[PDB]
Write an enzyme that holds these catalytic residues in place. Structure first.
Site, PDB file in Angstrom:
ATOM      1  N   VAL A  17      28.133  -6.156 -13.837  1.00 12.32           N
ATOM      2  CA  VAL A  17      26.915  -6.008 -14.813  1.00 12.32           C
ATOM      3  C   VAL A  17      26.108  -7.030 -15.278  1.00 12.32           C
ATOM      4  O   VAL A  17      24.876  -6.946 -15.367  1.00 12.32           O
ATOM      5  CB  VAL A  17      27.633  -5.077 -15.841  1.00 12.32           C
ATOM      6  CG1 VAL A  17      26.480  -4.916 -17.033  1.00 12.32           C
ATOM      7  CG2 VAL A  17      28.434  -3.875 -15.725  1.00 12.32           C
ATOM      8  N   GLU A  23      20.108  -5.209 -14.269  1.00 10.07           N
ATOM      9  CA  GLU A  23      19.759  -3.587 -14.249  1.00 10.07           C
ATOM     10  C   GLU A  23      18.381  -3.469 -14.399  1.00 10.07           C
ATOM     11  O   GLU A  23      18.129  -2.145 -13.951  1.00 10.07           O
ATOM     12  CB  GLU A  23      20.861  -2.918 -15.222  1.00 10.07           C
ATOM     13  CG  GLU A  23      22.289  -2.947 -14.830  1.00 10.07           C
ATOM     14  CD  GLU A  23      23.101  -4.118 -15.101  1.00 10.07           C
ATOM     15  OE1 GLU A  23      22.329  -4.987 -15.877  1.00 10.07           O
ATOM     16  OE2 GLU A  23      24.350  -4.148 -14.891  1.00 10.07           O
ATOM     17  N   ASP A  32      -9.694   2.254  11.788  1.00 11.89           N
ATOM     18  CA  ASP A  32      -8.682   1.275  11.025  1.00 11.89           C
ATOM     19  C   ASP A  32      -7.654   1.668  10.506  1.00 11.89           C
ATOM     20  O   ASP A  32      -6.593   1.194  10.072  1.00 11.89           O
ATOM     21  CB  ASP A  32      -9.946   0.995   9.932  1.00 11.89           C
ATOM     22  CG  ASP A  32     -11.004   0.309  10.478  1.00 11.89           C
ATOM     23  OD1 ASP A  32     -11.043  -0.684  11.269  1.00 11.89           O
ATOM     24  OD2 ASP A  32     -12.059   0.835   9.903  1.00 11.89           O
ATOM     25  N   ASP A  50     -12.607   0.826   7.003  1.00 13.46           N
ATOM     26  CA  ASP A  50     -13.307   2.109   6.517  1.00 13.46           C
ATOM     27  C   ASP A  50     -13.431   3.356   7.305  1.00 13.46           C
ATOM     28  O   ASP A  50     -13.470   4.393   6.928  1.00 13.46           O
ATOM     29  CB  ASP A  50     -14.586   1.865   6.024  1.00 13.46           C
ATOM     30  CG  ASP A  50     -15.827   2.011   6.916  1.00 13.46           C
ATOM     31  OD1 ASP A  50     -15.480   1.777   8.115  1.00 13.46           O
ATOM     32  OD2 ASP A  50     -16.902   2.601   6.773  1.00 13.46           O
ATOM     33  N   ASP A  76     -12.677  -4.600   9.584  1.00 13.31           N
ATOM     34  CA  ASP A  76     -13.490  -3.894  10.432  1.00 13.31           C
ATOM     35  C   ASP A  76     -14.855  -4.450  10.019  1.00 13.31           C
ATOM     36  O   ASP A  76     -15.190  -5.061   8.949  1.00 13.31           O
ATOM     37  CB  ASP A  76     -13.433  -2.389  10.045  1.00 13.31           C
ATOM     38  CG  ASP A  76     -14.266  -1.596  10.898  1.00 13.31           C
ATOM     39  OD1 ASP A  76     -14.424  -1.845  12.223  1.00 13.31           O
ATOM     40  OD2 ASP A  76     -14.811  -0.606  10.492  1.00 13.31           O
TER      41      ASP A  76
HETATM   42  F1  BEF Z   1     -16.666  -1.922  12.599  1.00 16.49           F
HETATM   43 BE1  BEF Z   1     -15.668  -0.544  12.870  1.00 16.49          BE
HETATM   44  F2  BEF Z   1     -14.571  -0.549  13.876  1.00 16.49           F
HETATM   45  F3  BEF Z   1     -16.290   0.459  12.293  1.00 16.49           F
HETATM   46 MG   LIG Z   2     -15.699   1.146  10.283  1.00 18.07          MG
END
Ligand code: BEF
Ligand SMILES: [Mg+2]
Length: 880
Positions: A287, A292, A627, A623, A334
């Site tokens: 303990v 805990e 991705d 985005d 990206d």
């Molecule tokens: F530049 Be990304 F892969 F839309």
């Molecule tokens: Mg993109």
């Protein structure tokens, strides 16, 4: 990988189907055989499976064994407390796992609901679910592509392949078979399921369904994406295995000591009593050593960091994700939609008069040439923006009129000033539309199109006026500017005006010679204004940034050099080169390559996996759909508010405001969060080490247990949890952003934190040992009470010393951390609750625990903390 290379007849014969279609019997047999065109959702881990998975932690195993031992021993209340703690920890871990696993369903909503398929010689709106390789589907504008396939009849078809290329750009589709291998985004003669058709009509033959499609491949990668262990999670797992081994060794030592006291003692001491004492000592050791409340404290600090970065409009779904950002060593990125705004804009421009760097924002101060350039840019437009910046058609015309409006010159006023009097749409090979709208008392025809076609069609130019048709110096300057823009990967459109006819009788082909070039405008997806600062901060933070994008090599190279990702005239790695690259070659050529272009989603997952293979916490930020596999595969995935929903779900963070600075802010907040979590864990385990040392010293001296199970549970759950959270509230280190990313195998107690843990635990244990000795000078019950008091007060005042490992509390600001002071005061209140006459019996504190014994124990705890400060000073002065 071979369908697009093969001819339309070849792929028709491969699928055993004709251009007319396939019969109902054939389609139903092909549906029963590998049919059912849909993304099969993963069953995923059930709740009970996650529950049993959370019980494999060595701390959880040790606590379960301790609870069972207590239940056998009759300590029902303490065992129930341990069971409740285990239930809470398992619930927290399972909730976190479910939040992480919410990156599921693969967004099958991307697949088309219906599909215009000519079956049995009849055109029907058959649902895309019942589609098989061999089915011939007719495509039109605004229709999602139901299944992957190869074109065989397409009239000016354009498909928004924004889920592989990542860009809402209408990729032109031609039915000609590709003679050579091309990238996944360059498959001109092959549609892809889930990609919207922007313009034109087309009709292809399905070659892939369900998981055989490219979006099917994306869904498969999402399902098979590795559940990455958080660096805090992996450090805690390693230290939990070490602590479980140490606790097993401690229990073995306890039983060996008692067996020695029996066998090497006398037969009067019964085996039953000695074994019972050994069991109580072992359960107390378990303990004490096991924190805990550690899971709750870590969860609370991670939630505090998550709220801190949610104040900056960056929702972190996973609580350990902020830490994962803190330990990030590589930020994969990206370009289209993540680095750039996914919105085409005009960034540069040129006229024979010259280029005034940035285009002036005052039309009153505008030059005649600039005014005519903007005019023959707006009145020949095709797109429009009316309400909340709604985009009409292709992003090129949107870019043109957005640049026009960005100079405080609304394009709608010019369009209403000069009414359109007829126009010609895009003519494929003829990039010149050449609208014939009447101008102001001039009736001049305006045109816009590609660079080369414009330069070939016309010979005049607007140098100062209607310049004589010489084509040497102006031609050289024009070609140099166009080549410079191309080297900058800037899309170029040239515009001109002719007025010789001044009739505007018909709307057809006209005198395409002598259009009098006045200038041309560059165009690219520009990096976000916050991108450059984020890249500069990441490089200052020791975090390299890698660009993985679906754009061509030129655009990715230009964007990387624009934001400083590459060196001077560096060479990016195309998706084709990566596909032809074996994993060993990629690993050998991973640090040198900083920008990847024309990559497929599987290429993104491959790059992220390779970077994680090098022992670097990869931060894939994207985005688009492409991705999402890399967002899930990465230890931390960062999405954008304007990104697609699947990218948001697959990523732990979602930048709702699309602020790329928030990525480095998350890195810094995570570094601070890990520093504070290390402080809290060091504090908890220093208190645990003090309790362990006290218990072991009581054992070796045949002494009574310094603390019962209830006392240790109370200290570890309510008297250490609050100071640990307070230390998790610690202010950020001044050099939190200048530190190199922490080693993935550094360990939870590293860089002088293990030394601080050992010193603080040793001194706390020494204080509790002395207090227990003084209590045994009075009575064993008094010994238990004073040892518990000394441990609890030393651990309460250890909040000040655990604030920093090199700077004392007196010197770092005693009251700078108001949370530390509040937690110390509340722990004083809790301990005073313990010594209440009603609650004295619960915490094995006798009614004879007078103010003298309390004074001795509190003075011993205060001396422990003072000697801890002295030891910290001696350490940071002598050896480091
Ligand atoms: F530049 Be990304 F892969 F839309
Ligand atoms: Mg993109």
């Amino acid at each position: 990988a071979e369908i697009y290379r093969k001819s339309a007849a070849e792929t028709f014969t491969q699928l055993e189907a004709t251009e007319k279609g396939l019969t109902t019997s054939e389609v139903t047999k092909r549906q029963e055989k590998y049919g059912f065109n849909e993304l099969k959702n993963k069953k995923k881990d059930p709740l009970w499976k996650l529950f049993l998975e959370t019980f494999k932690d060595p701390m959880v195993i040790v606590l379960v064994i301790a609870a069972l031992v207590q239940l056998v021993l009759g300590e029902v209340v303490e065992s129930l407390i341990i069971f409740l703690v285990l239930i809470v920890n398992s619930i927290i871990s399972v909730v976190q796992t479910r939040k992480a696993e919410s990156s599921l369903d693969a967004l099958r909503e991307m697949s088309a609901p219906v599909a215009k398929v000519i079956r049995d010689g009849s055109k029907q709106s058959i649902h895309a679910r019942e589609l098989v390789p061999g089915d011939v589907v007719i495509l039109d504008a605004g229709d999602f592509v139901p299944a992957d396939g190869r074109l065989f009849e397409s009239g000016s078809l354009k498909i928004d392949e924004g889920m592989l290329t990542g860009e809402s750009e209408a990729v032109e589709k031609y039915i000609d078979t590709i003679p050579d291998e091309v990238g996944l985004g360059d498959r001109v003669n092959m549609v892809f399921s889930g990609s919207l058709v922007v313009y034109g009509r087309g009709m292809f033959v399905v070659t892939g369904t369900a998981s055989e499609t490219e979006i099917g491949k994306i869904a498969g990668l999402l399902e098979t994406a590795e559940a990455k262990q958080t660096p805090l999670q992996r450090k805690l797992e390693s230290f939990s295995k070490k602590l479980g081994l140490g606790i097993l060794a401690l229990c073995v030592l306890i039983f060996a000591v008692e067996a020695g006291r029996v066998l090497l003692g006398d037969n009067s001491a019964d085996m039953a009593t000695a074994i019972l004492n050994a069991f109580m000592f072992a359960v107390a050791v378990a303990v004490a050593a096991i924190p805990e409340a550690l899971s709750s404290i870590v969860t609370i600090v991670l939630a505090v960091g998550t709220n801190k970065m949610a104040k900056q409009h960056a929702i972190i779904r996973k609580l350990p994700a902020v830490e994962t950002l803190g330990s990030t060593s590589v930020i994969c990125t990206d370009k289209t939609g993540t680095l750039t705004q996914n919105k085409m804009t005009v960034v540069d421009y040129y006229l024979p008069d010259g280029t005034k760097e940035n285009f002036p924002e005052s039309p009153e101060n505008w030059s005649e040439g600039e005014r005519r350039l903007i005019h023959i840019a707006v009145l020949c437009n095709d797109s429009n923006i009316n309400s909340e910046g709604k985009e009409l058609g292709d992003p090129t015309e949107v870019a043109l009129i957005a640049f026009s409006n960005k100079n405080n010159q609304d394009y709608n006023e010019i369009r209403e000033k000069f009414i359109r009097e007829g126009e010609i749409p895009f003519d494929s090979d003829r990039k010149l539309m050449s609208t014939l709208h009447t101008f102001n008392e001039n009736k001049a025809m305006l045109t816009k199109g590609g660079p080369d076609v414009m330069f070939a069609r016309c010979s005049y130019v607007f140098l100062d006026g209607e310049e004589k048709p010489m084509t040497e110096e102006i031609l050289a300057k024009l070609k140099e500017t166009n080549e410079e823009f191309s080297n900058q990967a800037l899309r170029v459109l040239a515009y001109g005006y002719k007025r010789m006819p001044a009739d505007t009788t018909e709307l057809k082909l006209e005198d395409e010679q002598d259009i009098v070039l006045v200038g041309l405008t560059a165009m690219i997806d520009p990096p976000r204004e916050a991108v450059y600062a984020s890249i500069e901060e990441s490089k200052k933070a020791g975090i390299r940034t890698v660009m993985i994008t679906g754009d061509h090599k030129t655009t990715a190279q230009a964007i990387g050099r624009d934001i400083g990702l590459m060196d001077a005239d560096d060479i990016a790695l195309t998706g084709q080169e990566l596909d032809a690259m074996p994993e060993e070659e990629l690993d050998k050529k991973l640090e040198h390559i900083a920008v990847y272009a024309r990559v497929s989603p599987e290429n993104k997952i491959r790059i992220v996996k390779a970077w994680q293979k090098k022992g670097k916490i990869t931060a894939m930020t994207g985005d688009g759909v492409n991705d999402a596999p890399a967002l899930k595969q990465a230890d931390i995935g960062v999405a954008m508010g304007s990104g697609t929903d699947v990218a948001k779900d697959s990523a732990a963070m979602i930048l709702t405001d699309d602020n790329f600075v928030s990525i480095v802010d998350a890195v810094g907040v995570g570094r601070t969060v890990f520093d504070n979590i290390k402080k809290s864990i060091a504090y908890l385990f220093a208190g645990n080490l003090g309790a362990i040392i006290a218990i072991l010293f009581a054992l070796v001296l045949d002494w009574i247990n310094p603390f019962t199970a209830l006392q240790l549970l109370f200290i570890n759950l309510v008297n250490d949890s609050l100071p640990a959270i307070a230390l998790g509230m610690e202010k950020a280190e001044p050099d939190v952003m200048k530190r190199k990313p922490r080693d993935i195998n550094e360990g939870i107690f590293a860089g002088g934190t293990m030394r601080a843990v050992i010193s603080r635990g040793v001194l706390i244990g020494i204080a509790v040992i002395i207090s227990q000795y003084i209590g045994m000078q009075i009575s064993p019950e008094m010994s238990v009470a004073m040892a518990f008091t000394t441990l609890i007060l030393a651990r309460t005042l250890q909040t000040f010393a655990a604030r920093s490992n090199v700077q004392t509390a007196f010197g770092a600001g005693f009251f700078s951390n108001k949370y530390v002071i509040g937690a110390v005061l509340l722990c004083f209140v809790l301990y005073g609750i313990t010594v209440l006459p009603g609650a004295r019996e619960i915490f094995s504190i006798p009614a004879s625990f007078g103010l003298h014994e309390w004074s001795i124990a509190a003075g011993l705890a205060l001396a422990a903390v003072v000697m801890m400060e002295i030891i910290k000073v001696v350490q940071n002065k002598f050896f480091k």
